[PDB]
Design a protein around this ligand. Structure first.
Ligand SMILES: [Zn+2]
Ligand SMILES: [Zn+2]
Ligand SMILES: [Zn+2]
Ligand SMILES: [Zn+2]
Ligand SMILES: [Zn+2]
Length: 145
């Protein structure tokens, strides 16, 4: 069970990652962190945050740093786009499964795509079909729900 450090400057707030929890309310500074954007964006959904962050690339050097950082993460695994709404999702250490914050699509992190077909939970006509006939979606999978 790995951990996340609050993004408020110099804050000592931290949490463990949990499969079903995508937001961290810091007990120190009380700010709400988003555990898939790794950022505090309390008047935005994740899509509004990520688009505005790309608009600050022209030009903030800090934003341009992180936006180009993310584009290497996506091009090399350790980050991915939601297969449904296409927001950039970053890893939650120890969690093989994530429910998108914007569209609520279940994402299989092990296989870097959807958990299920359209029609959602139970539809093994798409997605990673973990455990059908006993086979895990990947032999490293431990629990993608
Ligand atoms: Zn904090
Ligand atoms: Zn977010
Ligand atoms: Zn989504
Ligand atoms: Zn899976
Ligand atoms: Zn699996």
């Amino acid at each position: 069970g790995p951990s996340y450090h609050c993004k408020t400057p110099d804050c000592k707030g931290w949490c463990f990652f949990e499969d079903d929890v995508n937001e961290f309310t810091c007990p120190v500074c009380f700010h709400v962190n988003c555990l898939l954007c790794k950022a505090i964006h309390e008047q935005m959904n994740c899509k509004e945050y990520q688009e505005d962050l790309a608009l600050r690339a022209q030009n903030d050097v800090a934003a341009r740093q992180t936006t180009e950082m993310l584009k290497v993460m996506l091009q090399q695994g350790e980050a991915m786009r939601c297969p449904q709404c296409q927001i950039v999702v970053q890893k939650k250490d120890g969690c093989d499964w994530i429910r998108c914050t914007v569209c609520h699509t279940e994402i299989c992190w092990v296989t870097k795509g959807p958990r299920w077909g359209p029609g959602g939970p139970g539809d093994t006509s798409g997605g990673c079909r973990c455990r059908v006939n006993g086979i895990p979606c990947h032999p490293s999978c431990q629990n993608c729900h």
